[PDB]
Swiss-Prot record:
GO terms for cellular component: ATP-binding cassette (ABC) transporter complex, substrate-binding subunit-containing; outer membrane-bounded periplasmic space. It comes from Escherichia coli (strain K12). InterPro entries: ABC_transptr_periplasmic_BD, Bact_iron-sidero_bind. The gene is fhuD. Fe(III)-coprogen binds at W37, R53, S72, Y75, F93, W186, W242, F243, Y244. This is Iron(3+)-hydroxamate-binding protein FhuD. It comes from the Bacteria. Induction: Induced 1.3-fold by hydroxyurea. The keyword Transferase does not apply. Its main location: periplasm. The complex is composed of two ATP-binding proteins (FhuC), a transmembrane protein (FhuB) and a solute-binding protein (FhuD). FhuD interacts with FhuB. Substrate-loaded FhuD binds FhuB more strongly than FhuD alone. The record marks E55, N57, E59, H156, S192, R195 as: Interaction with FhuB. GO terms for biological process: ferric-hydroxamate import into cell; iron ion import across plasma membrane.
Length: 262
């Protein structure tokens, strides 16, 4: 993807890969929601919004003449169709088990394509150092499991399991993941609110994403008020963190994690 200033990112994972390498995306799919769900790595105003990740403005892309386009494997438009617009590459979020391991590989891969090998190494070094440096902030904490969630709608809570982006972080800090149930490839699964009642002695973090109306509707139900971890005072709403990102999202998680239970 020769011209580093004409790269269009059709999904948020590669946006994060580009940003970690110092690249300013020429175009980004759904800049609006990127701000509501990813937030942390801010996108400059100059970035062109090329439409929803699942339905990018194909005419716009064609007119833009991107030097290269990057997206997430198995997500969004057909890579075959996309490759017809401009050169491109899809990136894997995970191998289905360790998203973070893949993130490191993805960054490296992106760096090689753009000959930013050094920048990748500098970032990866900052990543591992940051993660390790924060370990002491969770030493005092015991073996109480942690439940990571986000409200999809009043009737559905998304929970992140063992193969979620967050697991590796939890593992390094000795924090058991309360959710050991099924998960999709991306490390999450949507469950009915009642399913959360099964958890008594656990801490629960819920990622906000400008959905106060929904959180309010949820918290007004007697069920939510009856929730053992709620009554136990173990529930906390926290800032949005992209669950399907890479190293920047992981580091963002650690910051949020720290403020919440560090």
């Amino acid at each position: 993807a020769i011209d580093p200033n004409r790269i269009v990112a059709l999904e948020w994972l590669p946006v994060e890969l580009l940003l970690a390498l110092g690249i300013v995306p020429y175009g980004v799919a759904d800049t609006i929601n990127y701000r509501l769900w990813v937030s942390e790595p801010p996108l400059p105003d100059s970035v062109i919004d090329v439409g929803l990740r699942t339905e990018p403005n194909l005419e716009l892309l064609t007119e833009m003449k991107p030097s290269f386009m990057v997206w997430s494997a198995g997500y969004g438009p057909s890579p075959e169709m996309l490759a017809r617009i401009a050169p491109g590459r899809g990136f894997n979020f995970s191998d289905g088990k360790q998203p973070l391991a893949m993130a490191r590989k993805s960054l490296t891969e992106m760096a090689d394509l753009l000959n930013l090998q050094s920048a990748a190494e500098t970032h990866l070094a900052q990543y591992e150092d940051f993660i390790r440096s924060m370990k002491p902030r969770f030493v005092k904490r015991g073996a109480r499991p942690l439940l990571l969630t986000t409200l999809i709608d009043p009737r559905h809570m998304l929970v992140f399991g063992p193969n979620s982006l967050f697991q590796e972080i939890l593992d390094e800090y000795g924090i058991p993941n309360a959710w050991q149930g099924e998960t999709n490839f991306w490390g999450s699964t949507a469950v009915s609110i009642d399913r959360l009642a099964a958890y008594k002695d656990v801490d629960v973090l819920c990622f906000d994403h400008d959905n106060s109306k929904d959180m309010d509707a949820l918290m007004a139900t007697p069920l939510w008020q009856a929730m053992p971890f709620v009554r136990a005072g173990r529930f906390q709403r926290v800032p949005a963190v992209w669950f399907y990102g890479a190293t920047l999202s992981a580091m963002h998680f650690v910051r949020v994690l720290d403020n919440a239970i560090g």
